[PDB]
Amino acid sequence: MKQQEVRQRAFAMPLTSPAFPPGPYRFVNREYMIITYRTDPAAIEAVLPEPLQMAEPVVRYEFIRMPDSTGFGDYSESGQVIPVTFRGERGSYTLAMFLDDQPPLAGGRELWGFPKKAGKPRLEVHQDTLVGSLDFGPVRIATGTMGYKYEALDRSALLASLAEPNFLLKIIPHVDGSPRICELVRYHTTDVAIKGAWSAPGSLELHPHALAPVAALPVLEVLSARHFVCDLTLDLGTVVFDYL
Amino acid sequence: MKQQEVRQRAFAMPLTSPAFPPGPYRFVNREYMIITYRTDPAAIEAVLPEPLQMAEPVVRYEFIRMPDSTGFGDYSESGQVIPVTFRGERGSYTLAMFLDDQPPLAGGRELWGFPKKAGKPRLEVHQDTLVGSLDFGPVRIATGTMGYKYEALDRSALLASLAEPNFLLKIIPHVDGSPRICELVRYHTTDVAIKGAWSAPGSLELHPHALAPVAALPVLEVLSARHFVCDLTLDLGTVVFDYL
Amino acid sequence: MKQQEVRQRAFAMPLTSPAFPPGPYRFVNREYMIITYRTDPAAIEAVLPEPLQMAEPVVRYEFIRMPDSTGFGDYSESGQVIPVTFRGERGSYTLAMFLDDQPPLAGGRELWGFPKKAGKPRLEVHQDTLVGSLDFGPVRIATGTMGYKYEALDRSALLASLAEPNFLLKIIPHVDGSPRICELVRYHTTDVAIKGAWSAPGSLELHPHALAPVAALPVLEVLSARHFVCDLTLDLGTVVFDYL
Amino acid sequence: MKQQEVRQRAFAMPLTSPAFPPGPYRFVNREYMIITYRTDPAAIEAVLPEPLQMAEPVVRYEFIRMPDSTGFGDYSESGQVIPVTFRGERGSYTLAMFLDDQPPLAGGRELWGFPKKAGKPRLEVHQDTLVGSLDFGPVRIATGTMGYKYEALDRSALLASLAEPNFLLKIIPHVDGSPRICELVRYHTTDVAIKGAWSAPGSLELHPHALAPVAALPVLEVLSARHFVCDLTLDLGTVVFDYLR
Amino acid sequence: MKQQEVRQRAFAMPLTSPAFPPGPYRFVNREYMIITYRTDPAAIEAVLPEPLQMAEPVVRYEFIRMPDSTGFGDYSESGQVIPVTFRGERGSYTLAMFLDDQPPLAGGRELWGFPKKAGKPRLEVHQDTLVGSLDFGPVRIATGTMGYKYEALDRSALLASLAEPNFLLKIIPHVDGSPRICELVRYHTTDVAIKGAWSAPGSLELHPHALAPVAALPVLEVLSARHFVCDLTLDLGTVVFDYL
Amino acid sequence: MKQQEVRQRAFAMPLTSPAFPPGPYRFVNREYMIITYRTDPAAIEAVLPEPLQMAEPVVRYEFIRMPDSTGFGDYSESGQVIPVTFRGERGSYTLAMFLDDQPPLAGGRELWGFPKKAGKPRLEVHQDTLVGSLDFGPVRIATGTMGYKYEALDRSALLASLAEPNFLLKIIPHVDGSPRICELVRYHTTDVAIKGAWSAPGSLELHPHALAPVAALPVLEVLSARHFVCDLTLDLGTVVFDYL
Amino acid sequence: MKQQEVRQRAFAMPLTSPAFPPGPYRFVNREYMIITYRTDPAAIEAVLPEPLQMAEPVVRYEFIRMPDSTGFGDYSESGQVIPVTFRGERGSYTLAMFLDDQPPLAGGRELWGFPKKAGKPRLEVHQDTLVGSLDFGPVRIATGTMGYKYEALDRSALLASLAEPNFLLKIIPHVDGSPRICELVRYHTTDVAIKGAWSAPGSLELHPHALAPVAALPVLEVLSARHFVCDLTLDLGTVVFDYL
Amino acid sequence: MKQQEVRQRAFAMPLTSPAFPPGPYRFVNREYMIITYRTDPAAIEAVLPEPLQMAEPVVRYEFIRMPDSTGFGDYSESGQVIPVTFRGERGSYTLAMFLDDQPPLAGGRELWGFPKKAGKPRLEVHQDTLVGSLDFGPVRIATGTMGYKYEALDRSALLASLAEPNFLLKIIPHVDGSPRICELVRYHTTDVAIKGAWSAPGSLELHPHALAPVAALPVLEVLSARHFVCDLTLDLGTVVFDYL
Structure with missing residues (x-):
């Protein structure tokens, strides 16, 4: 398999059996x-x-x-997102994520630049309460709770939320440890269909961890809680600022 | 967090809590x-x-x-390596790895370009038999067996095998899915200490898997088995051929 | 809170974190x-x-x-209802009911006056059989079985039955133990969308219990068994008869 | 079952098999x-x-x-009570309570107006520590600890709190959602026999929950801890203010 | 239970509580x-x-x-199907099935003449991998694996495959052990709705079994893997060739 | 494999690996x-x-x-048998059976016409009591008990019991749902050797089930109980009345 | 414990509590x-x-x-035997055994010279299938399967196979590691009673193991399967060829 | 024993089988x-x-x-120490300590006057994280985490810290409950050989407990985290201040 065949098939490691595939990336029943x-x-x-x-x-x-x-399978995720502005546009910055499946973790990092690590997130209804948890090894680092579907929320406002640009700092070292990729990446979730969306009383508790420091953005006051279910496509991102 | 802080600080994502640290990467008691x-x-x-x-x-x-x-923790690996020459020099090529710990998986992939995926390798003595196994979710894909330290091995010769160059094909996608990095990488294991080295009869059985295709290189005849324990430093790789 | 705003805010106990919310009470995929x-x-x-x-x-x-x-969560229910007339009008009377979730138990009792107690109902397909059970603590008091979807059920008869009036006897003691509320309450399930509806052969065995006396209406002969899945709204009731 | 006999029989739902019975409500070896x-x-x-x-x-x-x-069975309970005065008389106000048994739960709410919810309270000695805990489903919302019977308390003083009035805001919705009952209730614990009472160092930690917000009243400093066992009769309450009259 | 009641009522044994009901046999969400x-x-x-x-x-x-x-319940199946032509028309031939539920096993065999045996098929997503397995008592006889929804499939073409005739060889013994029924049967799946359809890499490993000889048709090379979800009606078959 | 080879090998489905074999059918230590x-x-x-x-x-x-x-393996069975007369001969009619093994269940139905379904029967001594039970899924439908071997029973009378004809209504649908086989079948158990046979106090309780309606022949009074162990051969049956 | 007591008493180590007793070695109900x-x-x-x-x-x-x-207890064995002739006489050669009980392992090896190792053989009926398996620590090395007593076997012929000589190569090392005993040994099974003997379809799968190389003799085609139960006496062997 | 030899023999209770031995107290691979x-x-x-x-x-x-x-066995320890000066001399003070082994608990208390209580400390690597925990009965009261060996730690600073004086407050009541011993005790760890020593990012959460009040020294800010393995001798103390 010649030089140009390599360059032509190359998408992700391993060349002949990539750790993740090309998209499109479609999500059904994201909750x-x-x-x-x-x-x-x-x-x-x-x-x-x-x-x-x-x-x-x-x-x-x-x-x-x-x-x-698609391409990834069946998994769960937990993360910290911050509202930002970039060039007069409102959007979000992803600071930290954690997932329980490999392909979307490697894929997330290497393609878009999601700052992903490994963890065990869960989101399930226990009788009357929706309970979110994230463990990192044997250590609980986040527990959230919500009432069950108390009030329907504005679906127009929710779609506007899911339409805003999502920014990521993509960093990939060169073989020598110096950055080979260091750039602000903009991505959108498109083709959104909202299946249901609610608000209810909510709560959050975070715990320190040396390697998962979600707790370094302290919970001073819980402001809001929303719960929705939707289908969407995670579109490929585009570079919006190349630090290099 | 100023703009040029970012481009001089950037090593790995997340920028402020990198998924793996810089080395040296020192290994004590690899077996x-x-x-x-x-x-x-x-x-x-x-x-x-x-x-x-x-x-x-x-x-x-x-x-x-x-x-x-160092920087990675305590873990296990399994994989497929092939003897190779590049510009006439004899070395190795790593086709496939599988590991049970995220920092060395991300770090392996993003820094050197080891072709790493997730899986559950184990290596254990069960009474008279050294048993290696590799599971990928619920499917066994590799089982190897060896008698226990039947005969001491020529260490000076072994250390010779371990001085050879190791070659990797590093591939990272650009945000648009075309390759951003696509290069052959040469790395050495250095400062090696062999604590022991043995030979004994060996066996290997592989099983198909859509996502872990080790069985694509079929075991026609087992030729040898080696068992050894060492300390070593995984040095940073160099680019020896850039396809781009 | 000011004495006036208490009256204005009061819905259910606890005042500041009510044991159940207002609604509307929407049900999706009741089975x-x-x-x-x-x-x-x-x-x-x-x-x-x-x-x-x-x-x-x-x-x-x-x-x-x-x-x-909505407002209640995810739960199961079992109990007894009897065909009734009130002023010539055909409807149903709920004699006994059993649930494994507290918000719909308190809310059912305090708002509409459903005659609810605690229990553990289950409804599950085991291979070829739909199996309903009700335990009350360690004692099984009801076991129902049906074949799986033998014949389509008449959607029109079904929708007419769901459109009927349901009557409940709401009783609430005053702090002295004498009745503060004692009334016949009429309510309706509306916005009914049936997703599927079937008949099959069915069975029922009931067992004695001092605090859950379903068996007091003995099974002389099983007449029919129906299985259906639907969405509906549990509308607020209205008083049709006040004993006081 | 004539409509007259219905009114005579009526105490709690379901009419013919009430979720709880009438008292007297007696408690033995309440800890x-x-x-x-x-x-x-x-x-x-x-x-x-x-x-x-x-x-x-x-x-x-x-x-x-x-x-x-009596009438309720065998159960545990946890919750939050605050010191209060009504018309200058000093008493307690129950903010939140959580129990693992339905009869006292429904009865608690529908008779006196205790602000009750489901949960899993536990109280047990582990070697040297008295350990109290509350879980709401999968989540721990309260953990409390004490030494074991370090100092005896005078009982005669203790009974100073147990004879005080307890106040409850009773709220029962009407079928239409607006309040049908909205009154302050005064109840007393009578027949109080103290079997033992003690103090010891104590601790408390509280965790947030959307549906069980005990932690909304933050633990700034623990001030005292007490452990006691008693017999007690829970008397029927009286209305002392009716928001709806 | 008069004599000519029997010959007009008789569908399946036991006459008064048949082991399976008449259809239509409707399937929702076959995967x-x-x-x-x-x-x-x-x-x-x-x-x-x-x-x-x-x-x-x-x-x-x-x-x-x-x-x-409908009539059968909730269950799983595994099996071996071969492309065939009969009188020049392209169709399928079902060589072997295995199921974990009795009504469809008896019904499959006695009505259409599906070559059904008992076993324990499973089909489940484990993180990144769709895994099919078939156990016959304590022995694994089939393990298949697929990546997860790598690429959407041409549905109109799929629906084409599913319009083809399916052929069965129905054999029932007479009480004396000579064949009482021995015929080729043609059946269609009709009223098909494809909910989704995907392709992805695939693997298959088979193991010998004296009583479940799937491995008699050896996996020389895997050619393709498809994953799809649908609703369909299993129509009654017709006799296309009677050996007797 | 030609037409006549098919017709000649055809005994039971699947043709090339029959779900059950030909006999003879020999039972050792039936209890x-x-x-x-x-x-x-x-x-x-x-x-x-x-x-x-x-x-x-x-x-x-x-x-x-x-x-x-022989041919079938190791299994257990539970059933309801009724004494009948046919053409001046005393015998039995089998109304319902349940077994935990496939080959004898398919074989029983397709060859003789035993009205068999799936279930979990058990028969074991617990200390002082012989206890018979039959579950159908999670539901107990029959529990019998007997004292242990109180009195030896007449072995001549028992052999006469095992010598009487056993009648079955064999029904097998045609592909179109109409009966293709509908006949009274007579079978005998021959070559009987009784190893032991006893009577003792006995008891029976039956529970309703929609798909296993053993309870529709109510236990009004227990008359007798026998327990025996024997070897025998289940001879092929013969048609004694063809409804068709 | 006098010197010539030792040389006349000595049978097996430990002299005063031998690891196995002298025979006759009688086996009842070998299967x-x-x-x-x-x-x-x-x-x-x-x-x-x-x-x-x-x-x-x-x-x-x-x-x-x-x-x-007798003398050994209750246990299981698995192994590989090959048809052979010695000086023109047809017999067997035992290549490999594995047992789960020490006395017959030591005794087998030190007295006759059976080539015994440790392992965990099992032979069990699972519903319709006789299943043999052999595990060597955590690795499965052999799985065999058979239908259950499909047809009676010609016993007189079987007893013929069991009259043939069995040959063993006995090897014991001298203290210095050179062979002290190295001889071909002939032994018979005598006083044989066949309790039953059957044939049925069969399967066999072997897996590699460094220390249990059964798979070194590859299963190219399974030819027959036999299942039988007997009593027999393992007679002492004779030396038929001494290499030393 | 004679009254004189009692004095001569007395070290710890029980006289004849002391709850802990004299030493020297040597520690190998403390971590x-x-x-x-x-x-x-x-x-x-x-x-x-x-x-x-x-x-x-x-x-x-x-x-x-x-x-x-030596003399103590194999155990774990957790607790709190504070940097201190005594007469101008820099050292440490041990406030609280927790152990899961009794000989070092009694011996620690009675000999040096370490302020020891019972508890269950653990220190373990879970993949990429060093996790320290302290439970006191069913309550977790301390959880620490560090990355694994990010950077070498200054051996000189380390050895100087280990060479510092440690002070303890030894208190022992007289039978009347008044202090019989009340003294500041100074001790040293000597013959220190460090095997490895590292730094990494670290975390700590503490929790309230009535009998284990570590939380009484609140974690305002984690300053550093060090990990090391060493051998040392726990030398006997000396009184530096007698309160009595």
């Missing part, structure tokens, strides 16, 4: 618990890369079920 | 079981990317324990 | 097993409150799954 | 662990309904075993 | 994993009953979930 | 618990096909262990 | 499953020690239950 | 996790006994494995 909390503004500023700019000092803490995902 | 088997030369040719050239039509099947790994 | 059986006429007459009037001497024994219930 | 903690005064006034007034800014956090309870 | 493999043409010829003629020397190995099956 | 009870004569008449004629209004309820059975 | 398979004649030649000569290129693979064995 | 955190100065001042003097307001929280401890 979100999102708890939004006020935090120390100084705690966001210490972690937000310029030229991104801080908006509200809030954090979106999320627990996501992805039972049906 | 190897290596079953060398003869395969179909045509299966080797099918996967070998030029300018690499095949040598003997053999596969070195590895089960490796790494209980003490 | 029913109903076994209609002939019983002793005298047993029915002994429990039916005038001004309610007995229609035929049958009991509909229900096993219901409610996997998706 | 308490009470951790008193100072909280944020602003947290208390937000949840205290006028004409109640606030007394000292503390919360009495409770874990109670009721192994022998 | 298929099909691994198509090339085999020894001589192994196919050895089992193919004339007047059926072999076509390509391939086997379609199936693992199928049927969670909602 | 029976038989509880005979008086029932409603109207309950037998509703289930007994003419030209069979009712004898006593009793039912033989049975629990059988078949640990050693 | 055999034997899968006869054709293999590579070249694999047979590679292991057959002259003056033994190979006969058919077949292996008799055995799984044997010995529940009642 | 420490130390997390240094800033706390509230007032909390430290509230527990520190004059003549001891407060140095910086930090607490070193320790999780220690002692797998090989």
Whole structure:
């Protein structure tokens, strides 16, 4: 298999059996618990890369079920998202995620630049409560709870939420340890169909961990909680600022 | 978190809590079981990317324990390695690995370009038999067996095998899915101390898997088995050929 | 809170974190097993409150799954309902009900006046059989079985039955133990969308219990068994008769 | 079953097999662990309904075993009680309670107006520590600890709290959702026999929950811990303010 | 229970509580994993009953979930199907099935003449991998694997495959052991709705069993893998050739 | 494999690997618990096909262990048998059976016409009591008990019992749902050797089930109980009345 | 414990509590499953020690239950036996055994010279299938399967096979590692009673193991399967050829 | 024993079988996790006994494995130590300690006067994370985490810290409950050989407990985390201050 055949088939490692596939990336029945909390503004500023700019000092803490995902399989995710502005546009910055499936973890990192690590997220209804949890090894680092579907939420506002740009700092080292890729990436979730969306009382507790430091954006006050189910496509991202 | 802080600080994602640290990457008490088997030369040719050239039509099947790994932790690995020459120099090519710990998986892939996937390798003595196994979710894909330290091995010769260059094909996608990095990488294991090294009868059985195709290189005849324990440093690789 | 705003805010206890929310109460994919059986006429007459009037001497024994219930969560229900007339108008009377979730138990009792107790109902397919059970603590008190979807059920008869009036006897003691509320309440399930509906052969065995006396309406003869899945709204009730 | 006989028979639903019976409600060998903690005064006034007034800014956090309870069975309970005055008379206000047995749950709510919800309270000695815990489904929302009977308490003093009035805001919705009952209820625990009472160092930790917000009253400092066993009759309450009259 | 009641009522044994009901036999959400493999043409010829003629020397190995099956219940199936022509028309031939539910096993055999035996098929997503397995008592006889929904399939073409005739050889013994029924049966799946259809890499391993000889058709090379979900009606078959 | 080869090898499906084999059918160490009870004569008449004629209004309820059975393996059985007369001959009619092994269940139905279904029978001594049970899925449908070997029974009378003809209504649908086989079948158990045979106090309890309606022949009074162990051969049956 | 007591008392170590007793070695109810398979004649030649000569290129693979064995206890065995001739006489050669009980392992090896190792053989009926398996620590190395007593076997012929000489190569090392005993040993099974003997379809799968190389004689085609139960006496062997 | 020899023999209770032996007390492969955190100065001042003097307001929280401890066995330890000065001399004060082995608990208390209580500390690598925990009965009261060996730690600073003086407050009541012993004790760890020593990012969460009040020194800010393995001798102490 010649030089140009290699260059032509190359998408992801291993060449002949890639750790992940090309898309499209389609998600069916994504289920979100999102708890939004006020935090120390100084705690966001210490972690937000310029030229991104801080908006509200809030954090979106999320627990996501992805039972049906092309190329990737059946998995769950938990993460911390921060509202930002970039060039007059509102959007989000993903600071941290954790997932229980390989292909979307390698794929997430190597293709888009999602800052993903391994963990055990769960999101399930126990009788009357929706309970989100994320373990990292034997250690519980996040527990969220919500009432069950108390109020229907505005679906227009939700679709506008899912339409905003999502920014990521993609960093990949060169063989020598210096960055070979260091860029702000913009991605969109498109073809959204909302199956249901609700609000209800919510709660969040975070625990410190040396290798999963979600707790360094302290929960000062829980502001809102939303729970929705939707289908969508994770579109390929585009570079919006190349630090290199 | 100023703009040029980012491009000088950036090593691995997440920028502020990297998924793996910089080395040196030191390994104490790695333990190897290596079953060398003869395969179909045509299966080797099918996967070998030029300018690499095949040598003997053999596969070195590895089960490796790494209980003490700087920056990475305590874990196990299994994989398929093939003798190769590049520009006439004899070395190795790593076709497939599987590991049970995320930092060395991401780090292996993003820094050197080891072709790593997730799986559950084990290497254990069960009374009279050293047993290596590799499971990928609920499916067994590799089982190797060895008698226990039947005869001491010529260490000076072994250390020779371990001085040879190891070659990797590093592939990282750009955000749009075309290759952003596509290169052959040369790396050495250095500062090696062999604590012991043995030979004994060996066996190997492989099973098909859509996502872990080790059985694509069929075990036609087992040729040798080696078992050894060592400390070593995984040095950073160099680019020896850039396809882009 | 100010004495005035307390009145304005009061819905259910606890005032500041009510044991159940207001609604509307929407149900998605309720799944029913109903076994209609002939019983002793005298047993029915002994429990039916005038001004309610007995229609035929049958009991509909229900096993219901409610996997998706707004404000309540995900739960199961079992109990006894009797065909009734009130002022000439054909309807049903709920004698006993059993649930494994507390918000719909309190809310059922305090809002509409469903005669609810705690219990563990289950409704599950085991290979070829739909099996309904009700345990009350360690004692099984109801076991129902049906074949799986032998014949389509008349959607029109079904929708007309669901459109009927349901009567409940709401009783709530005053702090002195005398009745503070004692009324016949009429309610409706509306916005009914049936997803599937079948008949099959069916069985029912009931067992004695001092605190869960379903067996007091003995199974003389099983008349029919229906299985259906639907979405509906549990509308608020209205008082049709005040004993006080 | 004539409509007249219906009215005569009516106490609690279901008419012919009430979810709970009538009393008298007797409790034998009721065991308490009470951790008193100072909280944020602003947290208390937000949840205290006028004409109640606030007394000292503390919360009495409770874990109670009721192994022998007439009409109810054998169960445990946990929750939050605060010091209050109504018309200048000093008493308690129950903010939240959680139990593992339905009859006292329904009865608690529908008769007296106790603010009750389901949960899994436990109270047990583990070697040297009395350990009280509350779980709400999979989530731990309260953990409390004490030494084991370090110092005896005077009982005669203790009975100073048990004879005080207890106040409850009783709320039962009408079929249409607006309040049918909305009154403050006064109840007393009478027939109190103390079998033993003790103090010891204590601890408390509380965790957030959307549906069980005990942690909304933050533990700033633990102030005292008490452990006691008693027999007790829970008397029927009386209305002392009717928001709806 | 008069004599001519018997001959007009008789459908299946036991006459008064038949082991399976009459249809229509409707299936909602059948899920298929099909691994198509090339085999020894001589192994196919050895089992193919004339007047059926072999076509390509391939086997379609199936693992199928049927969670909602009218009259039959919720169950799983695995089996070996071969492309065939009869009187020049292209169709299929079912060589072997295995199921975990009795009504469809007896019903399959006695009505259509599906060559059904007992076993324990499973089809499940394990993170990144769709895994089909078939156990016959304690022995694994089939393991298949697929990546997860790598690429959407041409549905109109699929629906084409599913319009083809399916052929069965129905054999029932007379009480004396000579064949009482011995016929080729043609049946169609009709009213088909494809909910989704995908392709992805595939693997298949078979193991010998004296009583479940799937391995008699050896996996020489895996050619394709398909995964799809559908609703369909299993129509009654017709006799196309009677050997007697 | 030609047309006539097919017709010549055809015994049971699948042609090339029959679900059951030819006999002879030999049973070693068959162990029976038989509880005979008086029932409603109207309950037998509703289930007994003419030209069979009712004898006593009793039912033989049975629990059988078949640990050693040619062609079939190791299994257990439970069933309801009714005494009948046909053409001046005393015999039995089998109304219902349940077994935990496939080959004898398919074989029983397709060859002789035993009205067999699937279930979990057990027959074991627990200390002082012989206990027979039959579950159908998670549901207990029959429990019998006997004292242990209180009295030896008449072996001449027992052999005469095992010598009487056993009648079965064999029904097999045609592909179109109409009966293709509908006949009264007579079979004998021959070559009987009785190893031991006893009577003792006995008891029976039956539970309703929609798909296993053994309970529709109510236990009004337990009359007798016998327990024996024997070897025998289940001879092929012969047609004694063809409804068709 | 005088010097010449030792040389007249000495049978097995420990002298005062020998690891196995002298016989006769009587076996009641040995049960055999034997899968006869054709293999590579070249694999047979590679292991057959002259003056033994190979006969058919077949292996008799055995799984044997010995529940009642004088001096040895209750245990199981599995092994590989090959047809042979010595000085023109047809007999057997035992290549490999594995047992789960020490006295017969030591005794087998030190007295006759059976080539015994440890392992975990099992032979059990699972419903319709006789299943033999052999595990060596955690690795399965042999799985055999048979239908259950399909047809009675010609016993007089069987007893003929069991009258043939069995040959063993006995090897014991001297303290210095050179052979102290190295001889061909002939032994018979005598006083044989066949309790039953059957044939049925068979299967065999072998797996590699460094220390249990049964798979070195590959299953090319399974030829027959036999299942039988017997009592027999293992007589002491004789030396028929002494290499020393 | 004679009254004189009692005095001569007395070391620890029981006289004739002392709860712990004399020593020297040698430790091999102690493994420490130390997390240094800033706390509230007032909390430290509230527990520190004059003549001891407060140095910086930090607490070193320790999780220690002692797998090989002469006279004591194999055990783990957790607790709190504070940087201190005494007469100008820099050292440490041990506030609280927790162990799962009784000989070092009694011996620690009675000989040096370590302030020991019972508890269950653990220190373990879970894949990529070093996890320290302390349970006290059913309550977790300390959880520490570190990355694995990110950077070498300064051996010189380490050895100097281990060479420092440790102070303890030895208190032992007289039978009347008044202090019989009340003294500041100084001790040293000598013959220290460090085997490895590292730093990495670290975390600590503490929890309230009435009998194990570690939380009384609140974690305001984690300053550092060190991991090391060493051999050392726990030398006898000396009194430096007698309160009595």
